[PDB]
Write a protein that binds this DNA or RNA. Sequence first.
RNA 1: GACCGAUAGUGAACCAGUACCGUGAGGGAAAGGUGAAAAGCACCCCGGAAGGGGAGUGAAAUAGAACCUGAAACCGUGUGCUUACAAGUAGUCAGAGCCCGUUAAUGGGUGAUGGCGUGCCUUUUGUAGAAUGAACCGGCGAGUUACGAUUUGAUGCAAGGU
RNA 2: UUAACUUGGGAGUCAGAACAUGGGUGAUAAGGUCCGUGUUCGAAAGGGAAACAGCCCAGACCACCAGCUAAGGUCCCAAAAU
RNA 3: GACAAUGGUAGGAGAGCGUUCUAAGGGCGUUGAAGCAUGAUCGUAAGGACAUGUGGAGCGCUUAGAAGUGAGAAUGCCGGU
Lengths: 111, 116, 143, 100, 48
Amino acid sequence: MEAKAVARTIRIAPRKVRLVLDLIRGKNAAEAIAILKLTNKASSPVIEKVLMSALANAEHNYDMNTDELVVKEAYANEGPTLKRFRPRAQGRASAINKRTSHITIVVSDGK
Amino acid sequence: PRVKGGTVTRARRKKTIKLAKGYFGSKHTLYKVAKQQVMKSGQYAFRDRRQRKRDFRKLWITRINAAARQHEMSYSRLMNGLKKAGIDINRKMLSEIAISDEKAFAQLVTKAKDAL
Amino acid sequence: RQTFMANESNIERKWYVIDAEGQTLGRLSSEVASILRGKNKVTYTPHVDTGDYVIVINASKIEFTGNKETDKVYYRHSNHPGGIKSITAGELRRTNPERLIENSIKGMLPSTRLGEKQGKKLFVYGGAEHPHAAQQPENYELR
Amino acid sequence: MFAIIETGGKQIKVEEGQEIFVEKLDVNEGDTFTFDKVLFVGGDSVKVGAPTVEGATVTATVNKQGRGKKITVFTYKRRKNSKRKKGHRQPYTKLTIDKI
Amino acid sequence: KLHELKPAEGSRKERNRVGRGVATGNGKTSGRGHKGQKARSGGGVRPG
RNA sequence: GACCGAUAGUGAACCAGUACCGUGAGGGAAAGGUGAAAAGCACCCCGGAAGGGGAGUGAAAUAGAACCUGAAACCGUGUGCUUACAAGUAGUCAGAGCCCGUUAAUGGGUGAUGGCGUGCCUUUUGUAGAAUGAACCGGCGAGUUACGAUUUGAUGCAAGGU
RNA sequence: UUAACUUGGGAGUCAGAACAUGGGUGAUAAGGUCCGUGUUCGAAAGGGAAACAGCCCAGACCACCAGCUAAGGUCCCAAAAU
RNA sequence: GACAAUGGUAGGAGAGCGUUCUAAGGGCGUUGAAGCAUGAUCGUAAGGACAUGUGGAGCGCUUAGAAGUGAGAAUGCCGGU
Ligand SMILES: [Mg+2]
């Protein structure tokens, strides 16, 4: 029996997120809280704040213990961009794609 | 009345892509790239139905030649006598006799030497 | 329909040792490059490894007719600029007679994904002994 | 034993209890067919061996008559406007061998 | 009746639409040939 | 109305000659759809908040204002077969070994090894061409109508037709 | 042996190329250029000439895991005579 | 049932599939249409069905009529990546 907590349209990029989500997949949930609190990147407290919602929606309202939980799948899809420009030299202008992302953490308990 | 371009550019560009599954990379996804590989994979097959018939004959002759040399006779001495000693009908797919029953293949070699 | 295709566990490949003394170089290497491809047997198919392991002893007494001992040369290159190196078939008999036969045979073998595996069924020795007595060969009277 | 029959302009090595592709004959299903032209009949001990040997006939029994798989025939030529496209289903006849 | 009408036999005819294929013949050049004056849109010289 | 149905029909179904460009005359796009009825998510829980997951309204929220159906390109996560001694317009025909079980028919996926094999148009006496064109996917995008002329096919009468 | 003239409807083409063989021009030079007759490419796949529109054999209605032959070939790569 | 033909670019002639709309006859549809998605099916070709899933109200078939009637390329035009 398994829970999830999806955060969507977070301001950060979708390729810089899934380096950190690659790192904690298939690991115990007691460690993976404290790996995201030692890495010095920019998407670590954002992923951390949504992992601590799949660990509170698995203890509340399903009533399963948070000592056995394991991260089954954790994947970052893609949300809509925000096309803003940048005035570049000789009368030109280049398009800058600020991308956003969807983050989904799914915990499990081996059953 | 305005004929809108309907659902015929869906279906016509599926039944080419669905013929082309199993190809590398983008040759199974895009239309234009998997189209013009389907036109060549029905052209290569047309000269490979004609070539299959004559490259299984470059194999049956190889087995017969590797059967008469152990009875100390050439191949060209073997499909000489069996047109001339007997009227043993011209067959090379039936080099299956030489593989299966060596005792059966020996009496033909007896009849070829007998009237040549 | 009714054809036969010999595969990885439908054949055996037994051993041959051939005395390579008293006979010329490219008249020998045709009754070796056909043993390695397996054209002495029925149940020959393409695309698999039939054939027989061939051992060659007395590499020191192969022959040449005419001035091939002085006017047959073996050019090789080295991919640096100005690197072609020459070696003749009179100094190759005396120095390294194990290579001389081993390139007289591997020029007669097919397209080189399987013709690399067919060529490595061939053991070329210089003297009259061989350490492959544990594999039970026999003498092959080649024509 | 075995025997060699000649059916559709080509020769088939057949033994017993065996099912075959043969190109089209003129029989309905459930019938019985007879090959009056056999070539090399006999296994190891049984031998005749002859040019179109006489006396021995081989029977059959038809299981179904139908059509093979559709073989789409395409042919184009480059730089030009030439193309063709066809499709073909060669009709066969399946037998079952009862006696030599 | 009116739910079943047949024209006169041999009276009617299809019409040739050019440029709409490659195997219909009249395609990729519409039955004019290659370059020239009278293969241009509105070319062809005055009669006589 | 044998006229269009949101790249269509007005430039304009949205508060259009309006954002915006120009000193000026002047140029000028983008926009539509919850449900039958707002009954538009009370209350608990992680959160600074966003955004979530339960409980609830509803025929269905896998219709929650990014709101009907939701294609391809392109980015992902999972798994049956496979690949680290080989020179590949990437396919084709011959074929072992492995995992499966359909609209039931001499089946499907994968592919160790062998043979043949220098993309598609356009212009050329002749293009693999190191001659031209396309990044990819999706829409839109070219022999039409009028009044005459001539020949062919049909049909009504026919020294008369209209 | 099986075409050919006549009357009317509809277009295309007017840049040609190598090889063989009679000659001009050039230097008994060019894969040169300009004319006469024939073939192939143009608009033609297939086997051969190692690769190669024009050279040599031969004109593909589609299917078959049958057969006899042409140009060219028979030790091995590569089918057939060490 | 005999004997015959069937490579083909410019180009001439013939025969067909499909798409939107209208008229007439018949018919399926909330016990679920169109559209989309997967499949090992049928015809000489373009193309036709049928079987579960998603979808939520309109659509095919036989004969004839009329066309804004078919997209791989125009350094094509707007949108997405
Ligand atoms: Mg290049």
